[PDB]
Amino acid sequence: KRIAIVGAGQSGLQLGLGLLAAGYEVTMFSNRTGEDIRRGKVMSSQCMFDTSLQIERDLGLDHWASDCPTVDGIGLAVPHPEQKGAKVIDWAARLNASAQSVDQRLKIPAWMDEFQKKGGELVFKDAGIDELEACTQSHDLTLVASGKGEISKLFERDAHKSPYDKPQRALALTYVKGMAPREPFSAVCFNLIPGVGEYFVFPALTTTGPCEIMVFEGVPGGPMDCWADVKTPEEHLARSKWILDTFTPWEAERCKDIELTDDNGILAGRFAPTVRKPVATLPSGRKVLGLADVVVLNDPITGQGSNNAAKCADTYLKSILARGDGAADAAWMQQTFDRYWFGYAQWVTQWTNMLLAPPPPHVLNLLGSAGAVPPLASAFANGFDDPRTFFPWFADAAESERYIATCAAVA
């Protein structure tokens, strides 16, 4: 009957709104006002694929579907090692159904407003242990949905599900107006710079209207680990243009007239991919359940965090509704995470952690073959909607060859 959620983020608000519509009382804690989120710094590039978008549609929460530009495909380019300014790999494939990127600066505050209008109890405070202890006394279940926030470290790191304990990439985002649209269809335009990093870009919707989002990932200490000395919006734009001129001049051609969407449409940072145990025990002995990035936090190189957020919240909502009047005890909490992890997120996570490492031979054979075998490119593109479909052929050389043959036979 009464649910508390700490952290007014994508997963937490989607869950909270779903719970209100099913007739629960929901208390939510936010450490920011909607307006400060709208006008603050960008948090994400939030490219959501069709299955995740459908989850929002089914809750009536796709309020931006008409105004957000669609992302219709996935592209991959790799610089030619010899021939200057050219590509040795350059292919694209259409997504079976469109993806969309609606800035969290728009979506989170709007969902916060809707949460209130639907009877959600929104409480504004930077919550700590004391708030969790209070919630667990007055609610049948308390979830922590606080992203990369500090209170997330209350959940114990799960070392066996976390192969990394340091950032594998130095990250940056630049939201821009004026980029030349991709033709003849839009796409996430991935650029793999061997041994250096990745640049990818795609159209999106933000607070000033349609834009494109540039995403930069640098191998730590290499030429694209290059944001430390950047201090102003204008130096950020300039450093962004520098990466494209230096490593992806074919993309620089689209960017001769780009401006920032706004001075806060920028970000630089890094974090270690981490998986945590989903049940935390408070000093009183009461329990809380972690949600989405609190328990599964991946590097954004695969564009999956917001997709995880939506699918995680959907799985948790289904689990709550099926429990009915049952107790939300530690076993039910652990089982809810297990279905999410074993059934889905372990595969998103394994795929992403593999891409962070240097690519093995069979993987380079797959990326190259895809430019000549369209069914295999199509399998790569649409694997972004459900990364389970990468297994076992992406991870294993012998299977990659069998799958290349399957694809070649229907080309």
Ligand X SMILES: Cc1cc2nc3c(=O)[nH]c(=O)nc-3n(C[C@H](O)[C@H](O)[C@H](O)COP(=O)(O)OP(=O)(O)OC[C@H]3O[C@@H](n4cnc5c(N)ncnc54)[C@H](O)[C@@H]3O)c2cc1C
Count Cα neighbours of 68 within 13 Å in the Cβ-side half-sphere: 26
Q: Which residues contact 277 (CB under 8 A, 6 or more apart)?
A: 155, 156, 157, 158, 295
Partner from ligand X, a second copy, none contacting 323, C-beta within 5 to 8 A by type = a second copy
Nearest to 103 by CA among 200, 175, 35: 175
303 binds ligand X (CB under 6 A): yes
How is 187-204 classified by DSSP, letter by letter? -EEEEEETTTEEEEEEEE
As given in the structure block, the two tokens for residue 145 are 């949905």
Considering only 17, 93, 102, 127, the residue that binds ligand X (CB under 6 A) is 127
53 binds ligand X (CB under 6 A): no
Partner from a second copy, ligand X, none contacting 132, C-beta within 5 to 8 A by type = none
Number of residues that bind a second copy (CB under 8 A): 38
Name residue 203's beta-bridge partners: 212
Torsion over CA of 366, 368, 370 and 376, rounded to 10 degrees?
-10
Name residue 123's beta-bridge partners: 29
Partner from a second copy, ligand X, none contacting 344, C-beta within 5 to 8 A by type = a second copy
Element (DSSP H or E) covering residue 21? helix 10-21
d(CA 65, CA 61): 9
As given in the structure block, the two tokens for residue 54 are 């459908």
Of the pair 248, 352, the CB lying nearest ligand X is at 352
- Letters for 27-66 (x = contact with a second copy by CB under 8 A, - = none) are -----------------------x----------------
Question: Which residues ranging from 142 to 161 are in contact with a second copy (CB under 8 A)?
Answer: 160
Q: How far is the CB of 303 from ligand X (least distance, A)?
A: 4
d(CA 360, CA 395): 9
Considering only 322, 327, 372, 397, the residue that binds a second copy (CB under 8 A) is 322
As given in the structure block, the two tokens for residue 296 are 């599964």
Q: How far is the CB of 43 from ligand X (least distance, A)?
A: 6
Of the pair 29, 390, the CB lying nearest a second copy is at 390
Report which residue type is found at 42: V
Nearest to 28 by CA among 43, 42, 11, 44: 11
Three-state DSSP class for residue 46:
coil
279 binds a second copy (CB under 8 A): yes
71 binds ligand X (CB under 6 A): no
Binding range to ligand X, per CB under 6 A, among 43-51, 88-96, 177-185, 341-349: 43-51
Binding range to a second copy, per CB under 8 A, among 187-195, 197-205, 290-298, 389-397: 389-397
Interacting residue ranges for a second copy, rule: CB under 8 A: 50, 96-97, 160, 279, 319, 322-323, 329-331, 333-335, 338-339, 342-344, 346, 374-375, 378-379, 382, 386, 388-393, 402, 406-407, 409-411
Interacting residue ranges for ligand X, rule: CB under 6 A: 6-12, 29-32, 43-48, 126-127, 145-147, 149, 151, 171, 173, 267, 292-293, 300, 303-307, 309
